Fold Seventeen Kilodalton Protein.
Amino acid sequence: GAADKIAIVNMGSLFQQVAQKTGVSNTLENEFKGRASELQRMAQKAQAFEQDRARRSNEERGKLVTRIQTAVKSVANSQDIDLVVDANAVAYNSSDVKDITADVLKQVK
Amino acid sequence: ADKIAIVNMGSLFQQVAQKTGVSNTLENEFKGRASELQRMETDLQAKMKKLQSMKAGSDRTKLEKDVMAQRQTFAQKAQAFEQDRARRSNEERGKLVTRIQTAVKSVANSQDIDLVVDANAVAYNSSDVKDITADVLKQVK
Amino acid sequence: AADKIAIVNMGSLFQQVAQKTGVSNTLENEFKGRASELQRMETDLQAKMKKLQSMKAGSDRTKLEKDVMAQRQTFAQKAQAFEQDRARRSNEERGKLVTRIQTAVKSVANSQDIDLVVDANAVAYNSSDVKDITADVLKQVK
C-alpha cells in the first residue's frame, strides 16, 4: 500500500519550540518597538504600521513552517514513512502510528 | 495495515457538555451576575426613556450625570462577567476534552483502531473507515 | 486490506470554486449599500457629537442631545442587524460551496476506490504515490 506506514507530528509544538530557539518573536519585537515607541508618544500611519507587523509576522511564520516541513520530510523519508498526519487532527494513535515530533525537531535546520 | 476511524469532536463536545452536567454547572454559577446585569440594564432602558421626554433643566441635567455613571457600572460589570465566563468556559472545555480523549482511546482499543482522525480534517470516508462518535459518547465518563 | 488514502486541498478548492461562482463579489454587492448608509450615519453622528460639545446648554443643546441619543439607538440596532445579515449570508454561501465540493469529493473518491481523503491542511507530509485529488475534484464540481 502507498500509505502503509503512517506517523503524526505536533506542528504547533514544533512551531513554538523552533520559534523560541530562533528568537523570531524577539526579533519581531525589536523590528518594531522603535516605531511603536515613537507613536505612543505622537495617525493613519498606525494603520500603515499595523499592516507591516502583520505582513512581517506572517512572513516569519511561513519561513518557520517551511523549515519544519523540510524536516518532517527528511525524517519521514529516512524512516520509510508514507504519511505524516498533523497531531492536532488526531484523537488517538497506536504504537503502529509513531509520533515523530522529537525526531523532526532534531533535524530542523 | 493500520485500521482507521474518525470522530466528530465538535458534534461531541456539546453532547458530552450536556451529558456530564458541566454545561449546566457553568450555567448556575453565572446566573447571579447575569441577573445583576439584566436588572441593571432595564433600570437604564427606563431612565433613558425618561430622558427623551424631559426639558432642558437641571433635574434632567442630573439624571444625565447619574445615567452616565450607571453606563460605566454596566461595562465594568459586563466584561468582568464576559471575561470570567470565557475563562471558566475554557477550563470546563479543557477538562472535558480529556474525558473525551480518554473515551476515544478506550473505544479505539475495543475496536482495534490504530488511528482515529478528527472529522473536520476529513473530506470523505468510505465504509471501511468507521465514524466512532456515537460509540465514544457512550463511553464518556 | 490497506485503506487507500488521498489528500484534497479544501482551502484551494474553496477559493477557486468561490472565484468561479462570484460569491464574494455577490456578497460585497449585497451589502456595500447598507455599509455605506451605516458609514454616513456614523460620520453625520460624529458631526453632532462634535456640535454638542460646542453648545452653551439650553433648548438647542437638549434638542441635539435627544436627536443623538435616538440616532445612536437606531444606528446600534441597524449595525447589529447588518452584522447578523452578513454573518448568516456568508454562512449560507460558505455551506453551499462546501456541499457542492463534498459531492464532487464523494464521486471522485468512489470512482478511484479511495477510502479516506484527508484535508491537506492536516498533512505535514505525504509520499508522492498518495494522490492529491484536488484537480480531479475541481473538474467534477457542479
Summary: Chain A has one domain: 1-109. Chain A has four helices and four strands.
